[PDB]
Swiss-Prot record, chains A, B:
It comes from Human immunodeficiency virus type 1 group M subtype B (isolate BH5). Residues 20-89 form the Peptidase A2 domain. Signal peptide: none annotated. The active site is at residue 25. This is Protease. Homodimer, whose active site consists of two apposed aspartic acid residues. Residues 1-5, 49-55, 88-99 are annotated as: Dimerization of protease. Aspartyl protease that mediates proteolytic cleavages of Gag and Gag-Pol polyproteins during or shortly after the release of the virion from the plasma membrane. Cleavages take place as an ordered, step-wise cascade to yield mature proteins. This process is called maturation. Displays maximal activity during the budding process just prior to particle release from the cell. Also cleaves Nef and Vif, probably concomitantly with viral structural proteins on maturation of virus particles. Hydrolyzes host EIF4GI and PABP1 in order to shut off the capped cellular mRNA translation. Transmembrane segments: none annotated.
């Protein structure tokens, strides 16, 4: 699709069989989701945002759908204010910015 | 242009007579710039994201040129770790997300 920016670019995602809302975020390197259970082992990661740094859990090779488009990749889980879909998965679905 | 998302989408902006580099952030409601002088009255604002909140100064009716495209709107100034172009200005330059 084409998504304009007059409103927040919120989409539905599917992860772990569950539908969630998330923000398409070109300003995010990574994909960060609120607390949930994911399978397998995780590794530690520190990430930064507008207000400082937080610790998250890094899960690799997670199956995720973004607005109906299939991706398989890294998902960070931790105390983000909002679920964000970042560039690691936006590149898998072929997303670009255009003006 | 078409901007891919393999790397951070950085652009040059001109604001207040100065050139700066800034991140195109579809996940940002507002435009947030590191400390600089701007004309006119301001009022304080708290803005949040990963890591919590920072205090900024809100300036209205600021003219800005983003990768060569002129727009006018509100600009927030304060201790942001990165200069951010948010949706309030991205709409004005006609920026969309496409996949
Ligand atoms: C979580 C809230 C929504 C998404 C977030 C994305 N902003 C980018 C800004 C760029 C960094 C300061 C971000 O945090 N990106 C992170 C996301 C986490 C991630 N890992 O992907 C990032 O890429 N972090 C990199 C570090 C980038 C460093 N950059 C640099 N040195 N130049 C990282 N690997 O940790 N938006 C925001 O932080 C904005 N928040 C908002 O728009 C709204 N706030 C809330 C809470 O929704 C509004 C109600 O204020 C701020 C700027 C105010 C207008």
């Amino acid at each position: 699709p084409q998504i304009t920016l007059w409103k927040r670019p919120l989409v539905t995602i599917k992860i772990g069989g569950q539908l969630k809302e998330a923000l398409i975020d070109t300003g995010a390197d990574d994909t960060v989701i609120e607390e949930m259970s994911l399978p397998g082992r995780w590794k530690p990661k520190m990430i930064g945002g507008i207000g400082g740094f937080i610790k998250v859990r890094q899960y690799d090779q997670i199956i995720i759908e973004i607005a109906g488009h299939k991706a398989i990749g890294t998902v960070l889980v931790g105390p983000t204010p909002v679920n964000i879909i970042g560039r690691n998965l936006l590149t898998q679905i072929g997303a670009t910015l255009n003006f």
